[PDB]
């Protein structure tokens, strides 16, 4: 038990309560986007690993592009995400904001290397991203979620378990001039750092937006956000018992995937409403 691991789970549970929360927000205005499909569900799939296994065979080059590509996505999504929250308090505001964002780019970009005080810019940086990629990010209906949790499930645990019993070198080992996709936390008693991927962050996003949207949808108010919210931090929770008492790394969708899934179906099942959860609205 450290205080580190509890700061990780603070972030990884805020940042998904109000991704999925803020989901639902425009989807009551629109009432007053890239949905996804299971063979785009699919095709994504297939990309990410290609992506990934490019990353660890032709490092040199991938990661300073990854590096520049992050940068640029990062800085959009904070300027689009705070100017989401100045606008509801009462243009030359939007310049300045795009501007000091830009700056705050620019400052992660030059400062990527002293690990003691950019761990905050780049925490900061993953936090828009999450946010404004779960935001913009719509899933049709659940049968999009369930393929896609099962075959990132599926994925991730063979690249990070079955991998080093064939590659000399798991994956993940050279993965986390470091990668700019994983959140960083020093250990906090005097500041070895923890390492959480976005992956953790958005999918087990992505299904809380979905649920959010359908709590609109139907009329029922917070039943679906707050269950999913509870299983995703409990499955947090489990991870980190796991893997303090395993002494390895974890896989964290193993323990997460299961958790979200079997709460949502339960909670669909016990109202009786999975067909309408499943088949999706319109
Ligand atoms: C909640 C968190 C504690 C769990 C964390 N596990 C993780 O973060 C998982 C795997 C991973 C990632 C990076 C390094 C190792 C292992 C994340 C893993 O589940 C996801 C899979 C995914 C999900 C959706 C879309 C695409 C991919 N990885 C992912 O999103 O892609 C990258 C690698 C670019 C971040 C972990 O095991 N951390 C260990 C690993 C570690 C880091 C540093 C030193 C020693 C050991 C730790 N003790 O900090």
Redesign the pocket.
């Known amino acids: 038990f450290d205080y580190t691991?509890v700061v990780?789970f603070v972030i990884?549970v805020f940042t998904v309560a109000l991704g999925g929360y803020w989901s639902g927000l425009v989807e009551l205005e629109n009432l007053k986007y890239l949905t996804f499909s299971p063979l785009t569900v699919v095709i994504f799939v297939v990309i990410?690993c290609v992506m990934?296994v490019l990353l660890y065979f032709f490092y040199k080059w991938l990661v300073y592009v990854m590096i520049a590509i992050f940068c640029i996505a990062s800085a959009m999504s904070l300027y689009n995400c705070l100017a989401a929250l100045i606008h509801k308090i009462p243009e030359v505001r939007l310049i300045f904001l795009s501007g000091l964002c830009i700056a705050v780019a620019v400052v992660w970009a030059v400062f990527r290397n002293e690990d003691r005080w950019a761990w905050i810019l780049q925490d900061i940086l993953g936090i828009a991203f999450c946010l404004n990629l779960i935001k913009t990010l719509k899933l049709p209906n659940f049968k999009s979620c369930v393929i896609l949790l099962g075959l990132?499930l599926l994925?991730?645990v063979f690249?990070?378990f079955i991998t080093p019993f064939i590659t000399k070198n798991?994956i993940?080992?050279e993965?986390?001039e470091k990668?700019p996709?994983?959140i960083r936390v020093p250990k906090l008693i005097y500041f070895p750092?923890?390492?959480?991927?976005?992956?953790?962050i958005?999918?087990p996003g992505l299904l809380i937006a979905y649920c959010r949207r359908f709590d609109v949808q139907t009329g029922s108010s917070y039943i679906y956000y707050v269950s999913s919210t509870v299983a995703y931090a409990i499955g947090?929770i489990l991870?980190?018992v796991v893997?303090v008492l395993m002494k390895k790394?974890?896989?964290?969708?193993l323990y997460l995937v299961p958790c979200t899934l079997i709460t949502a179906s339960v909670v669909a099942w016990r109202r009786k409403e999975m067909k309408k959860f499943w088949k999706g609205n319109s």
Do not use: H
């Open positions: 691991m990780i990884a990410c990934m990132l994925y991730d690249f990070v798991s993940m080992v993965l986390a990668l996709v994983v750092v923890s390492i959480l991927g976005f992956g953790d958005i999918v947090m991870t980190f893997l790394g974890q896989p964290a969708l």
